[PDB]
C-alpha cells in the first residue's frame, strides 16, 4: 500500500515535465 | 497487488514527450496571417497586393 | 509529543457511546414484548431506563434504538429472547443527578 | 565580469543589474549581421532601487562590451513587474551619424577613403 | 516540552503562549532538496551535471488544539487561521534549535476534528530561500548574555571569531554552509573607515573591490549587497564594480592604499 | 445542537426549520488558501515569491435527513435542491459563531441514501471572496449587537468604538483580520460634511485624499470604493485620486482645511 | 540489518503505554463509584494510584482517562462492574523511586 | 556488520564512525537503467531501436539513528544533513564490495521519526555517470591491493597485469565491464617516450593514432581524453586525430615508427 | 527443470550454468500485441481498420539467486547485472521451447532481497521486432542430428520440405506465421546459378524478379533482402527492381529464360 | 456447458474442440459505446449534443486451459497464440445465442499460470463495426434456420418474411435493431429485373431512386452500397443518385414505371 | 487488486494520446 | 470501494483532447516575427521598410 | 480508502484543465 | 495511510500550467514558411526574390 503511494508520487512527478517538442527543441 | 505495482511501473516508464508536428502549425499560422492581411487590405480599400 | 522528555504516549478522551444487552425468557403475549416488537418494526426511538426495583431508585435512562431482537427455542429448555439497544445521545446517569424515580405501574 | 552593469541614459548613476533571469539571457552574434543581448529582468527587493533606470537608450556593460537598449517591454501581471530587454552593440549606433555630402560621378575608391569619408567629423566618438 | 516561535512585525510570539489550548507536539524539517542541472547528450551514459542548487523545502509542526467548549473551539480555530496566514513571509524557529530561524510562508492546512473539543493539526511552512540562517548576524558578540548562539552552528572551538578589524591584513571566518554571495540574494554588509584610496582583496576567493577616490576617516564606505555607498550616496560609477564574497571557513583579506583601517563585517550565517 | 442560517433575497431562513427532517450535524471551514507565484533564477538557490493572494475556500456542513417515507424523502430532496441552488450568492452563518457570515455560492452535493427514509449529505459552499466578514457594516447597529470576540475580549461590549466624528483629529478602529483596501474590491464608504477645502490624512498608513474645491455644509462628499462623489456626482477630476485604506487596529486620522466637519465611516470587517 | 552475518532479526524499544483494568462488585451509592461516574462524564483526568494496602507502601501512580465503565446484573448473582483506564503519560514507578505513600 | 565509506574533499570518512548513533543496516544498488529510442515505420511490425544508453542509477543504504536524547537527535539530524549535502559529487563504497566505488550526488531523504531518539532513514545517491568504477586508475597501486573479483578469480593476486611497457608489441588488459572510450567522456591517459615518428595500432579494436613529426626521448607524448599533447602543448594539427579505445579483456597493441619506446596506460575500470 | 540460454557475441551461455547460485524458476511470454490502424469518420459507427500490425512485447523469466554469504551475494548481483545488460541486442531462448528464439533488449529489473543470502528476480526482455523466429534458417537440414527443430513449429507432417531446387518450376513451403517480405526488414536470401537471362515468378503471390543480362553457370546471382548482386556486385540498375515474397504455406515458383537452374532459399521462419 | 465458434478463412472451428484442453467458462459482451460531441454556449445552461455514434465494443470470454504437462502447456499456449491472432478480422458466436455473430479482431490477452498445468485467461475481441449482425444475409437460408428471437417471438418460424417480390407494391421487414443505411457503410444489395423506366419509392422512409433510361428483362439493375450498376457497369450518371435505406420493422415499397418486375433484397440484419 | 489494475489499464489508453488540436487537425 | 471505480471510470471518460486557439498563436508568432524584422532592419541602418 | 477516491477524483479533475500558456494568454 | 493522502495532496498542489516558449515557435514557423516560399519560387522558375 505504501509503494502504491510512492508509485503515485513518482507517477505525477514524471507527469509534471510534459513534452511538446517542436522538432527537437523543447516547447 | 504486486502485479498491479509492476504494471504501474511499466506504465510509468512511458516518455512524457509528445511530438507535435510543425508543418501543420506553420500552414495554419500562414492561413490566419493571410486572413488578417485580407482584412487589413479590405479596410484599406484596394491599396495592397490585390 | 515526541519532542518532550519521557517516552510515554499521550492520550485524551474522545466521544462517548453506550449500549444495553438484555436477555431472558420470552412470552409473546406480554405487553412489554409487544411494545418492543412495535419499536423494532418501525424506527420510533424508545425511552429506556435501568432501575432498582427493590431499593426504589433509578440508575440510568435515555433514548435508544432496537438494533437486534432474536429468539431461541431449544427442545429441552424454555424458549428465550435476546435484545440489543444502541444509544442516541447522552445516557443520563441518575445515580449522581436527582429525579428520575418513576417506576412501572 | 559575468554580470551586467547598468548605466543610465544621462550617465548619472552606474550600478549592477542583479536578479536577471539568466535562464532567459541570450547573446546573439552573426558576422556582418548582428550583435545583441536579450534577457528579462524582474523587479525584486535587490534591484528595486535601480529598476526604474533600466529602459530605452540605457547602456549595459557585459564582458567588457557596451550594448545600447533598443527595445524595453515593461509588463505587470499582478505582483511581478518584468522588463524584456533587447540591446544592440554600440557600434550600430554609428547609424546616428549621416554624411550628407556626395562625391558625384564614378570613381575607384579604396576602403580607407570610404571609411574616412563615412566617419568624418564624428560627434559620437567613433 | 516543544514550542514554536514566530517573528512577525518585529514581535516574537510563542505559538503556545498566544493560544493556550494549542500545544506543539513535535517539529520536523524536510531535507535539503538538492538538484543538479543535468544535461543529456544522446548516445552517452548518464548526465553532465551543471551547478548543484537547492530547492525550497517544508518545515512541519504537528500540534493539537484542546478547547473548553464548541464555541470556544470554533473561535480558537478562526483565531489560529487569522494568526498563521499573513500577507507577507515571516520568521519561525523552534525550542529544539533556538539558534536557527527560517523565513517562511504558511501553507493551507485543515483541522482534523477528532472530538467535540479537540482537533489535530499539522502546520506546514514553506521555506523558499532553500536554506536556514542564524537568528543573529556576525555583528552580534559571541557572549553568553546575548542568548542567541547554540551548539551545532559550526562555531570553531579552536580560535576567537571577531568581525571588526583594525589592520590591513586579517582573516574572517564564515561559519555558514554556503559561500556568501550578494549576487545570490545573500545578506552581506561591509563598513570601512580609513584614509586614502582603498582596495579590498579576498585572496582565498581571489576577488577585489576597488574605489578610485580619496577617502577620509570621517567618511564611511558601506558595501551593502551589490551597492557601494559613501555617506549613503551611490558611488558605483567610481568603482571597478567588483564584489567580494566569503567562502566557507577562513578567508584572508588584505587592504591596500589606506591607513588606520577600521573595517567591520555584518552578515548572517547560511545553514542547511 | 447546531444550525445553519442562510440570508438570501432579503430573508433569513434556518436550515433545520425550513426543512423539518433536515438536521445539521457538524459545521467546519477550510483553511485560507494562500496562493503565491514563484520565480526561479538559474545559478541561485530557492525561488522568489510574488505577491500572495487568497483563493476562494470551502465552508462545509455535514447533516442528515430523516424523512417520514419514500415520497417525503424524494419531495425533501427536490425541495432542498430547489432552495439551495440559486443563481446568485447568499450569506450563511452558524450559531456557534453567530457574529461572522460568509457570502457563498453553493457547491454540488450528493445524497448518500442509507435507508429508505434516511440520507446523509455534506453541503459545501464556496466562499469566493477569500474572506469572511461581519454580519453588518461599521455603522450597522447589528454588527456590535450579536457577538464578536477578538484576542479573548468581546467587541460587542466595548464602548470606545465610534465611527462618526465631529473633530479634526481622531482614531478609527478596524477590527478585521487584515487591512481594508478599496483597490482590493473591498467595501468602504466615507461621508463628510464640512466647509472649506477638505484634506484627509491617514497618518497610520500615510495616505492622503484632497479635494481642490470649496465645500459647503449642505454638500456631502462621499468616497465609495475608488470613486469620490459630491452630491452623487463624480468629481474625480478635481481631486488627487487618492485612496484611503484602513489598517489593522487603530488608524489615526487628521482632517485639515475645513471646519465644522462631520465624518462617518461605513465598512464591514474582513476576517481571514 | 540484512548485511550482518548471522541472519537474525533485530528490534528496538520505543514509546511506552499503560492501562489498568479493574473489576468487582458494584454498589451505586458508594462515593468512589460516584467519583468515577463524575470523572467519566466530565472528561477530566483522574489521578489513579496502585497501593499495597497491607504493607503501607505505594506501588504505582499516574493520570488516566476512563475509557470504559460497564455493569452486569445477572439474575442469580450480585451486580458487578468493570472499569478500564488509559494513561496519558508516565506511570510513576514508586517502587524504584521514593515517595507516594499517601493513603486513605 | 556493514558500513559506508565516503571519500570527499580528499578525506575518507566512515558513516558509522563520523556519527556514532548512525548504523548502516543494508546496502543495495539499482539495476543499470538501459534507455533506448524506438522509431516506428507505418506498414511494418515492431520498432527500430537506436543506440542504447545508460541513465544515472541509484545506490541505496537503509540505516537507523539511535540518539541519546531529543537534543542529540536534532543535533545529529542537522549534522547528517550538513555532511551529506555538499555542492559537488563525491565517491562512496561499502565493506561488502570494497574494491568498487561510485561517484555520486546525494538525494533527498526523509527521517522517519519512530521514537523520541530513534529514526529510520534510507540514504539514496544518484550515480550520474551511469557506471561504477575501480577505487583507482590502472597505474594506481590502490586498485590492485584491496580486492577485485571477475568471473571467479581475484584480480588483486594476478601477476600478469602490467600497464607500463618497453617493447613495441604487447597486450593491455581492460578488466572493466565494457569498453573504455574517451569519446564517451571516459578517463584514459596514454604516455609515450620514444625516438622517431610514433604510430600506435590497436589491432583488437582496429584503431590507429599517428603523429607526423619526429620525436626525441625527452619529449613526452600524452594522449588524454580526445586531446594529444607534446610537452603539455596541444599538437592536434600534426596528427590524424585518432582516438584509441580499449575493448573488454585483452587488447593487442603494436607500436611502429619509433625505437626505445616506453609507454604507460593510466585509466580506471568501468563496471556496469 | 527450466533454464534460459543467451546468444551473445556468437557464444551460447546458459544462465544457470554461468551463475551457479542463480536458477530460473519459470518463463512466460506476453501475447502478441495486435493493433489495427483505426480510422474514424465522425457520425458513423465503429472504425475502419487499416493494416493490422504487431507491437513489441515482453518475455519474462522469474528466477532466484541463492548465495553463500553476503559478499558473495553482492558480487553475484553485480556480475549478473554486468552479464545481462549489454550495449546491443542479443538472442534468448528457453528449455521449454528450444526451437524458437527471440532477439531482445534487457529491461531494468531490481533484485528483491528477501534474506541475507537469497534474492528474487523477474528479468524482463523487450522483444522489439514483434515476432519470434526459429533458431535455424531454411538451409539447415530437417534431420535429428542437427538438434534444432522441435514440435509446434508448423512443420508439415504430410510431405518433404527442401529449399534447394534443380528445375524451372517447384514449390517452396514457408512455415512461418507471417508473409516473408524483405521490405518489412525480414531476412531472405536467394542464390541462383543458371545459364541465360533469368526471370523468377512467384505465382501464388504474383511477384516477379527480372534480370536483363546474360548469365553463366559460374556466376551466382544473390538476392539478399532488397539487394540483387552477381559475384557480390550491385546490379540493381539492370533489373526490374521487383522483389519476391513468400506467402504463408506453399508458394509456386516458376523460372523462365535459363536452363540447368540451381536455386536455393535461405530464410528464417517468422513465428508469433 | 458453453462454447465459442470462430469462422475464419471460410472454415468454422469450435474453441473447445480445436484445443482439447481449453474450456470456455463464461461469455459476455460490453454495452454499446455511445459517443457524443457536446458544444457549450456561454450564457446558457447545459450543452448541445451532436450526432451520436457507436464506438467499437468488447466481446469477452473467460476460460481455462488444463494441459497434460508442462511441454503440453507451452505447446497449447503457442498454438492458441498462433490460431487467435490473424491479420484479418473473423466472425465469432456462442451456443447461448447461436443466431447472432460478431465480426471481430483479437485483443491482447495474458495467461494467468496458476499451476504447472493450469492457466486461466480471458479472451477479448474488439467488435470494430459497433454492432452485431445475423449469421447470414436476408436471402441466406441459414439466417432463418438456426434461431432468432425478437420481442419474445422466434423469427425462424415466421412464414410471412419474404425478400423476393414480383408485384409493384409490397412490404419488406428489416428485423435489425436499427435502420440499415448504405451511407453508414452497411451492406445492402437490391437486384431488379423489369421492363421500362424504373422508379423505387420507400414510402416508410420517404426515399426514392430513379433510373432515367429504358430497361429490358435481360438487364439486371443492382444497387450495392452507394453504387448502381446495370449489367455490372456503373451508370450513376443516368440516375438521381438516390440511396434507399430500410427502417426498423416494416417498410412499404412502391415500384412505378416498369412492368413484370422481379426485385430481391439481400442484406444482413444489424443488432445493437 | 482488480480496482487499481483497471485504473492502470484505463490510464494506458487516454493520457498517452494527448490533445493539442490546432483547429481540427492533430498538432 | 465500487463507487471509487465508479468515479474513476466516469472521469476516465474525459476527452484527451485540448483544443488550443490558432488566432492567438498566429498573432504571437506575427509579433515575434515583427520583433525579429525590426532587429534586422536596425542592424542594416534603415535600408528596409522603415 | 474513501480519501484515496476523493484525492484521485480531484487530481484528475484538476488535470483536465491543462496549461499551454503562450506568454500570458491561454493557448 | 494518511501520509499517502498528504503526499498525493501535496502533489495535486502542482499548477496544471505549462508555459511554452514563443520565440522558438516563431523561429520554427519562419523556417517552415521559408521552405514553402523556396518551393513555390522553384516551381515558378526564378520569378521571385531569387
Q: What is the DSSP letter of H195?
A: E
Cell of F208: 492622503
Residue whose cell numbers read 542529540? H72
Instruction: Give kind and range of the element (H or E) at residue I84.
Output: helix I70-84
Which set of grid coordinates corresponds to residue B36? 488578417
Residue numbers after which chain N breaks, C to N beyond 2.5 angstroms: none
Count of residues for chain B?
50
Subunit contact G89:C6, Cβ cutoff 8 A: yes
d(CA E54, CA I180) in angstroms, rounded, equals 57
Length of chain D: 126
Q: What is the three-class DSSP state of H204?
A: coil
Give chain E's length. 272
Q: In the block, which residue shows the cell 589491432?
A: H203
Which residue matches cell numbers 514554536?
E4
Asked if the Cβ–Cβ distance from M22 to L28 is below 8 Å, we say yes
The C-alpha of I52 sits at a distance from chain J's nearest C-alpha, in angstroms, of 6
Long-range contacts of J236-241 (CB under 8 A, 24+ apart): J238/J211, J238/J212, J238/J213, J239/J209, J239/J210, J239/J211, J239/J212, J240/J208, J240/J209, J240/J210, J240/J212
Region for L35 from its dihedrals, namely left if φ exceeds 0, alpha if ψ lies in -120 to 50, beta otherwise: alpha
Cell of C100: 428520575
User: What residues of chain N lie within 8 A of the CB of A4, using their CB?
Assistant: 4
Is residue E31 within 8 A of residue H109, CB to CB? The reply is yes
Backbone angles phi, psi at D84, to 5 degrees: -95, 105
Candidates G1, G14, G15; nearest CB to H25: G1
**CB atoms inside a 10 Å sphere around CB H272:** 23
Q: Is H176 exposed, middle or buried (0-12, 13-18, 19+ CB in 10 A)?
A: buried
Residues F177, J78: Cα–Cα separation, whole Å:
74
Which parts of chain C are beta strand (E)? 19-25, 46-52, 57-72, 80-87, 92-93
Does the distance separating the beta carbons of C13 and E26 come in below 8 Å?
Answer: no
HSE at residue D5, side-chain half, CA atoms within 13 A, is 20
Q: Which of K11, K14, K18 to probe by mutation at the L interface, max L CB count within 10 Å?
A: K14
Rg, C-alpha atoms of chain E: 23
Decide: helix, strand or coil at residue J85.
coil
Contact H118 G3 (CB under 8 A): no
CB contact under 8 A, G28 and C52: yes
CA J14, J19, J21, J22 dihedral sign is negative
List chains touching B (3+ CB pairs under 8 A).
A, K, L, N
Name every chain H residue with its beta carbon within 8 A of the beta carbon of I56. Answer: 38, 46-47
CB–CB contact F50 D23 (8 Å): no
Q: Please tell me if residue L47 touches chain D, with a CB cutoff of 8 Å.
A: no
DSSP state of J152: T
Residue E32 at interface with chain H, using a CB cutoff of 8 Å: yes
Kindly provide the residue ranges of all beta strands, DSSP E only, lying in J68-141, ordered along the sequence.
Answer: 90-94, 100-106, 112-113, 118-127, 132-137
Backbone angles phi, psi at E145, to 5 degrees: -70, -15
Q: CA of M17: which chain N residue's CA is closest?
A: N16
Residue D53's nearest CA partner among D5, D4, D9 is D9
Contact residues, chain B, for N33 at CB < 8 Å: 26, 29-30
Helix (H, G, I), strand (E, B) or coil at H137: strand
Q: Which residue of E has its CA nearest to C2?
A: E26
Burial group, residue C85, by CB count within 10 angstroms (0-12, 13-18, 19+): buried
Encode burial over F178-203: b for 16+ CB neighbours within 10 A, e otherwise. bbbbbeeebebbbbbbbbbebbbbbe
Contact L7 M9 (CB under 8 A): yes
Is residue J135 a contact partner of residue J101, using CB atoms and an 8 Å limit? Answer: yes
CB contact under 8 A, C8 and G15: yes
Beta bridge partners of I59: I29, I125
- The method recorded for this entry reads cryo-EM
Residue G35 region, left (φ>0) first, then alpha (ψ -120 to 50), else beta? alpha
Shortest CB distance from H45 goes to which of I105, I107, I184? Answer: I184
In DSSP terms, J63 is beta-bridged to: J24, J121
Quick one: cell of J121?
485467461
- Is residue I108 classed as helix, strand or coil in its secondary structure? coil
Output the CA–CA distances (angstroms, integers) from residue K16 to B15, B17, B18, in the order listed: 9, 10, 8
Q: Tell me if chain F has a CB within 8 Å of the CB of E130.
A: yes
B4 vs K5: CB contact, 8 Å cut-off? yes
Residues of N in contact with M4 (CB under 8 A): 4-5, 8
Confirm if I138 and I267 have CB atoms less than 8 A apart.
Answer: yes
Pairing verdict, β I112-113 and I118-127: antiparallel
Residues of chain H contacting residue I184, judged by C-beta atoms under 8 Å apart: 43-45
Residue numbers in L near B28 (CB within 8 A): 22, 26
> Is the Cβ pair H37, E32 closer than 8 Å?
no
User: What residues in chain G have their Cβ under 8 A from chain H's Cβ atoms?
Assistant: 1-5, 12-15
Q: Cα(E1)–Cα(E25) distance, rounded to whole angstroms? A: 8
Q: How many CB pairs under 8 A join B and L?
A: 16
Contact G33 C95 (CB under 8 A): yes
> Looking at beta carbons, which residues of chain E come within 8 Å of H56?
38, 46-47
Q: Report which DSSP code applies to E43.
A: T
Say whether residue H28 is in contact with chain I using an 8 A CB cutoff.
yes
Distance CA D19, CA F41 (A): 7
Dihedral-angle region of residue I196 (phi above 0 means left; psi in -120 to 50 means alpha; beta otherwise) = left
Among candidates H29, H54, H149 on the partner chain, residue whose Cβ is nearest the Cβ of I75: H149
CB contact under 8 A, G2 and I69: no
Are N29 and B29 in contact by the 8 Å Cβ rule? The answer is yes
> H75 and chain E: CB distance < 8 Å anywhere?
yes
Chain B residues inside the 8 Å CB shell of K12 = 11
Separation of alpha carbons C37 and C22, rounded Å: 14
Record: contact G3-I115, CB cut-off 8 A:
no
Interface of K with A in 6-25 (CB under 8 A): 15, 18, 20
Residue of N nearest to L26 (CA): N26
Nearest to D16 by CA among E228, E188, E192: E228
User: Percentages helix, strand, coil for chain K, rounded to the nearest 5?
Assistant: 60, 5, 35
Q: Which residues are CB-contacts of J60 (< 8 A; sequence separation ≥ 6)?
A: J27, J28, J29, J30, J122, J123, J124, J125
Residue in L closest to B37 by C-alpha: L30
At G73, give phi and psi (nearest 5°): -130, 75
Resolution of the entry in angstroms: 2.9
Q: Which of A4, A14, A22 sits opposite B16 (nearest CB)?
A: A14
- Chain C nearest CA to H72, separation (Å): 11
Give the three-class secondary structure for E70.
Answer: helix
Considering Cα of E124, then E128, then E131, then E135, what sign does the dihedral take?
negative
Contact M11 N8 (CB under 8 A): yes
Amino acid at each position: 500500500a505504501i509503494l502504491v503511494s510512492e508509485n503515485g508520487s513518482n507517477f505525477k512527478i514524471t507527469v509534471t515535465n510534459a513534452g511538446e517538442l517542436k522538432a527537437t527543441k523543447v516547447e | 497487488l504486486a502485479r498491479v505495482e509492476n504494471l504501474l511501473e511499466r506504465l510509468l516508464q512511458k516518455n512524457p514527450v509528445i511530438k507535435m508536428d510543425d508543418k501543420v502549425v506553420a500552414e495554419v499560422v500562414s492561413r490566419n496571417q493571410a486572413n488578417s492581411f485580407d482584412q487589413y487590405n479590405y479596410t484599406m480599400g484596394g491599396a495592397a497586393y490585390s | 509529543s515526541k519532542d518532550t522528555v519521557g517516552g510515554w504516549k499521550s492520550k485524551i478522551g474522545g466521544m462517548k457511546e453506550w449500549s444495553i444487552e438484555n436477555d431472558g425468557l420470552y412470552v409473546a403475549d406480554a405487553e412489554s414484548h409487544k411494545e418492543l416488537a412495535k419499536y423494532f418494526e418501525s424506527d420510533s426511538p424508545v425511552c429506556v431506563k435501568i432501575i432498582n426495583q427493590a431499593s426504589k431508585k433509578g440508575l440510568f435512562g435515555g433514548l435508544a434504538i432496537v438494533a437486534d431482537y432474536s429468539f431461541e427455542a431449544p427442545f429441552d429448555e424454555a424458549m428465550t429472547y435476546s435484545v440489543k439497544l444502541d444509544g442516541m445521545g447522552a445516557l443520563v446517569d441518575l445515580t449522581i443527578t436527582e429525579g428520575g424515580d418513576q417506576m412501572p405501574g | 565580469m559575468d554580470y551586467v552593469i547598468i548605466q543610465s541614459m544621462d550617465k548619472e548613476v552606474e550600478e549592477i543589474l542583479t536578479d536577471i533571469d539568466y535562464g532567459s539571457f541570450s547573446y546573439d552574434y552573426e558576422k556582418n549581421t548582428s550583435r545583441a543581448i536579450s534577457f528579462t529582468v524582474n523587479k525584486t527587493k535587490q534591484n528595486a532601487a535601480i529598476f526604474d533606470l533600466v529602459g530605452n537608450e540605457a547602456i549595459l556593460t557585459y564582458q567588457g562590451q557596451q550594448f545600447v537598449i533598443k527595445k524595453c517591454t515593461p509588463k505587470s501581471i499582478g505582483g511581478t513587474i518584468s522588463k524584456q530587454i533587447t540591446a544592440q552593440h554600440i557600434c550600430y549606433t554609428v547609424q546616428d551619424h549621416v554624411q550628407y555630402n556626395v562625391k558625384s560621378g564614378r570613381k575607384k575608391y579604396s576602403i580607407q577613403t570610404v571609411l574616412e569619408f563615412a566617419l568624418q567629423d564624428n560627434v559620437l566618438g567613433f | 516540552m516543544s514550542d514554536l516561535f514566530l517573528e512577525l512585525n518585529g514581535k516574537v510570539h510563542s505559538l503556545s503562549e498566544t493560544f493556550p489550548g494549542l500545544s506543539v507536539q513535535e517539529v520536523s524539517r524536510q531535507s535539503p532538496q538538492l538538484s543538479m542541472e543535468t544535461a543529456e547528450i544522446a548516445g552517452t551514459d548518464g548526465v553532465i551535471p551543471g551547478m548543484t542548487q537547492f530547492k525550497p523545502f517544508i518545515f512541519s509542526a504537528k500540534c493539537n488544539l484542546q478547547a473548553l467548549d464548541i464555541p470556544d473551539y470554533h473561535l480558537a480555530v478562526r483565531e489560529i487561521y487569522e494568526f498563521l496566514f499573513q500577507r507577507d513571509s515571516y520568521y519561525i524557529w523552534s525550542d529544539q534549535m533556538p539558534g536557527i530561524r527560517y523565513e517562511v510562508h504558511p501553507k493551507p492546512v485543515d483541522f482534523s476534528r477528532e472530538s467535540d473539543r479537540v482537533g489535530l493539526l499539522t502546520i506546514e511552512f514553506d521555506v523558499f530561500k532553500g536554506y536556514a540562517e542564524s537568528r543573529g548576524t556576525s555583528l552580534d558578540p559571541m557572549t553568553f548574555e546575548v542568548d542567541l548562539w547554540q551548539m551545532g552552528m559550526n562555531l570553531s572551538n579552536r580560535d576567537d571569531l571577531f568581525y571588526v578589524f583594525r589592520e590591513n591584513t586579517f582573516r574572517v571566518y564564515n561559519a555558514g554552509s554556503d559561500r556568501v554571495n550578494p549576487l545570490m540574494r545573500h545578506e552581506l554588509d561591509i563598513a570601512m573607515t580609513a584614509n586614502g584610496t582603498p582596495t579590498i582583496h579576498n585572496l582565498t576567493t581571489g576577488e577585489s573591490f576597488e574605489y578610485r577616490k580619496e577617502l577620509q576617516k570621517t567618511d564611511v564606505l558601506l558595501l551593502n549587497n551589490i551597492y557601494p555607498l559613501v555617506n549613503n550616496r551611490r558611488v558605483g560609477k567610481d568603482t571597478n564594480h567588483g564584489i567580494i564574497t566569503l567562502e566557507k571557513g577562513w578567508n584572508d583579506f588584505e587592504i591596500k592604499g589606506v591607513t588606520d583601517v577600521t573595517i567591520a563585517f555584518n552578515f548572517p550565517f547560511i545553514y542547511r
